[PDB]
Symmetry: D2
């Protein structure tokens, strides 16, 4: 019922389409896809995926301007400048901005200039753009927001349990490190890049790099403003990442008590968002998990009674994409966005 447009049919754009496809009675209607590549690629790459496997659905090209998934035809256009997009003419309600190059107001605002009524950025927004994390602060969303951000994948993994730690133990200060799978923003082989570290061969190195995910947490949990920071360590895995959080808390506690608090929420307010795994698994076992964060209970540690360490898993592609769909659903539910 909500006319949706996907801008940037990459890793997130395609995972988004597939997540949506598997949902029942969706309020969303994906009608257009805009990428710079062509219709043959959109169709081919949607069907075959080195990470998700072959898409269990009939995907084919429809003429020279559309693709069809199980019969449902989807228009495909190719305009590098968002202002030239036929959003107005098609009556596009919501644009899923996943190109990674229009994350600020002037850039994302271009979809509005093209006629779309609203924009949902699949990444942190730069400047003054409301950012939401489903299960943490989504309720503060209002239909008046013309441009919104669904934060980064690491923020969606961290925020959920950070919220629990803060509510139950009181976070004084903390730090975090994410051992993250590589992404398209890194180079296959040493090549130019503004980030001198992300410029080095991704599958051959442990690559330190910045992340705002920690500061970003404060955007959705204001009580943590100026209390967290961290970095990212990119490693040679194609998908699935893990966060390592260390915080000093006010209430003395111990590992199993902390784990118990997470199960409490995982069974209630954070059901579907946060999960707690008690099996000794490795990254690949968490591929395709719908939650945005899974605590590895056995790794939980507590030093000096108030220094808590939590290790949580997250499928940065699929889990995050379930959240974008989730946020899109909310936008659909708060009146024709």
């Amino acid at each position: 019922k909500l006319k949706v447009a996907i801008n940037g049919f990459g890793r997130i754009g395609r995972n988004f389409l597939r997540c949506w496809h598997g949902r029942k009675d969706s309020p969303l209607d994906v009608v257009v896809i805009n990428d710079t590549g062509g219709v043959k690629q959109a169709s081919h790459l949607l069907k075959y995926d080195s990470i998700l496997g072959t898409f269990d659905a009939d995907v084919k090209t429809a003429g020279d301007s559309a693709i069809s998934v199980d019969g449902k035809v989807i228009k495909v256009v190719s305009d590098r400048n968002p202002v030239n997009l036929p959003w107005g003419d098609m009556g596009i309600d919501l644009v899923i901005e996943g190109t990674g190059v229009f994350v600020d107001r002037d850039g994302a605002g271009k979809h509005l200039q093209a006629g779309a009524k609203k924009v949902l950025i699949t990444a942190p927004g730069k400047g003054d753009i409301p950012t939401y994390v489903v299960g943490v602060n989504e309720e503060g969303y209002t239909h008046a927001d013309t441009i919104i951000s669904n934060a980064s994948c690491t923020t969606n993994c961290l925020a959920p349990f950070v919220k629990v730690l803060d509510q139950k133990f009181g976070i004084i200060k903390g730090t975090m490190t994410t051992t993250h799978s590589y992404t398209g923003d890194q180079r296959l082989l040493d090549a130019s890049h503004r980030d001198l570290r992300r410029a080095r061969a991704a599958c051959l190195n442990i690559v330190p790099t910045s992340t705002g995910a920690a500061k970003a947490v404060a955007l959705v949990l204001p009580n943590l403003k100026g209390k967290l920071n961290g970095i990212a360590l990119r490693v040679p895995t194609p998908n699935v990442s893990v966060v390592d959080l260390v915080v000093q808390v006010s209430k003395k506690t111990f590992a199993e008590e902390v784990n118990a608090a997470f199960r409490e929420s995982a069974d209630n307010e954070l059901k579907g968002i946060l999960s707690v795994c008690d099996e000794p698994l490795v990254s690949i076992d968490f591929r395709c998990t719908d939650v945005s964060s899974t605590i590895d209970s056995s790794l939980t540690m507590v030093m000096g009674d108030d220094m808590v360490k939590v290790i949580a898993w997250y499928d940065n592609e699929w889990g995050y994409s379930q959240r974008v769909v989730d946020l899109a659903d909310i936008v659909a539910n708060k009146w024709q966005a």
Copy 2:
């Protein structure tokens, strides 16, 4: 003495600079580097390399327009359009075209429009562009050629021993497959690309893809016109590749006889170009080899007395780059190019 300009400071551009740097009494004088990135990257990536290791030389940035290697300053400019380059103003004799995007006459000819006297493409040339392979047909080079090609890496590996097989046994017809390391032209993760196979995650797949290296062989060895063809299989290794050649020959022979013929040439006319290894090594052992082709003698096979199979190694980055330097030296020796 020959004023040289490098256009495209990528894998080949940087290996070129380092190969040149290690040569004694070079006729070449590298004075300019043009890439789209900046001076900080040029300096940083020249010094640190995930494949060659840290460059054993003092590399640093010089102001905002140059880098210096052991004191020798090198101008660094950044122009995406070759026609705007200061080749004429600087009096550039030879431009090493290694961007991979100006391989035809109109594109490479743009360096000429900018003032450079000659262009050496570090890849197969499209259209009517003389192509040479040092040790196979370099002697046919004339200073009149304004634009020349040094062929592809696979051609420089194949041509040398193909020439021996043809001279000694008479090649009737043949085919070839190169199990090739991935390159910057492939995608880190499934992403758009004109080649639907090269679009898939490079470090997760065996990726079939086209190669003209086989037909290209006929350009340097006319006697083989229409006698060879093949394909490339890209695999998850960052550097070093291997060719697998299968040919039906006129003179009946046997493996050790074929190997012997290769050592004959490797010790004479092809010394420095072709090598023959009798040790049971693996790809990484061939990293940084100066030759452009190394026969793995023990893998040589002969079926039905006339079907010869040869397996040869090659450092597609460094070995090929030694050849570009070699061809540049020839250009310097045939009068101020």
Copy 3:
């Protein structure tokens, strides 16, 4: 109905169990599993698999001597010497020998000494052991065979279409190279090994190594005795391999004609064994395919009218395992083995 025992619960043993599990009305009854590890590992590794994903079935440990899959309990023992196994006492009909260390008559014969009635080696047999390839020579199997071999994975991929090429064009001589995923027989990091090449880090090199798969083809297709040979090139992919066959044939032909011959058989006598793919896919797309060989039609080439080159894919773990189940079914059908 056939009491089956799995000896060596490794890659093949576990894929075997899962292939079997997905079959309908199987004549096989897996009752025992013998590995050297324990019951916790058998259960854990059967459930979580870095290549197949999490097993969609209820797997758990049952006491200290068994595991259960969806309720069906399976005895688990741990004896390094096959002669001490309780095959006789349990009345084991067929032993699936997949340890890789009992491939000759004296070694595999030990299961017989322990009481098992028959042994099916999941690899080439050394010495005088009947070897079969489903779809090529299975019909020559007789219940009198006490020890049989299902050949190697590469043989099961090659034999099927080799048979077609021979029947329709007449193979004079040929050679082959398989660009193969690494296996447990290779070392993670340079370490001792009888094979000086398989001793080198598997995920960092292209590793040449021997293969009898070519000569082995003659065992199942006697008409090809002494007409084929080849080698293996191990590369950094965890599963799925590809064969590259080059043969000189008697009848002149051309690529599309050869492809057509393969579709003829793929639709008839080799249905379920051989498949022909016309899409430009990469290795990961062939993961979990039930056939044992898939021709990449677009890569097919023909030089000098009689030199045919065919490129075929194969899931060396899963596809091969479907064949072991298949051969086990045949053994069950030819009287209580």
Copy 4:
């Protein structure tokens, strides 16, 4: 002058030999090598190494019982049981125990039973075995120790700067996570292992696993007893690892002040042990570094004025091996060990 024997010619054994080889005026004389493999492997693997490259020295086999490096012959034996070793008969002073299977007193004591005067374990010792970390507590070593441990690689990376943080700021409590390269103790493909996580394919996963390196730190810095803990995250890189330490300190401070303290020591008491890097490098750039720990100054962070986070690099193979040589030198200097 000190007769040294290497037991276990694996990654550490071979790096040890090469580190030693590059030292000047060494007090050590390596005369025997005992591994289970053969003389051909010892020679071959010492010469060709997927991580260090080809050994720049003349290595060859000498008969069927020795290898020679640049002329120096070294006896090679093969006994799986240390008690059968000819240590006494050869008059072996010190045995470098690097097999990873004799880390407790009864197991390592077997070399003593064979006649060796002393044993140096290239890993944490289990039970009551003095453990030393060069640059932290080596001075407490006495010749009376018959069996000693050089700790783990992570301990040698952590202890050095931990000592500085404690001396200058007072460590109250802390935790640590090492994003570690995989090692021979992990499986190439999902296979049985006592550790259910280390049993999963190493090059395909981020693998959590235990480490005593944190508790081990207290062995060499008693002041930190019961103040630290942590875990290891194994990732798909063949060599070089990184430690992430988070501690609450007594004296309020800030990042650059902490970095300054490290340079103070790196220029004095810890020169050659601890280094401080100010360049934005990635793991591969730290390959072959002789120090055992290199602080990445730009990643240093301080939260709430007393929570310090330090990121340090370390070549777990080569850097650690320089330390074993170093500890061996000390043993040689404290009288004929």
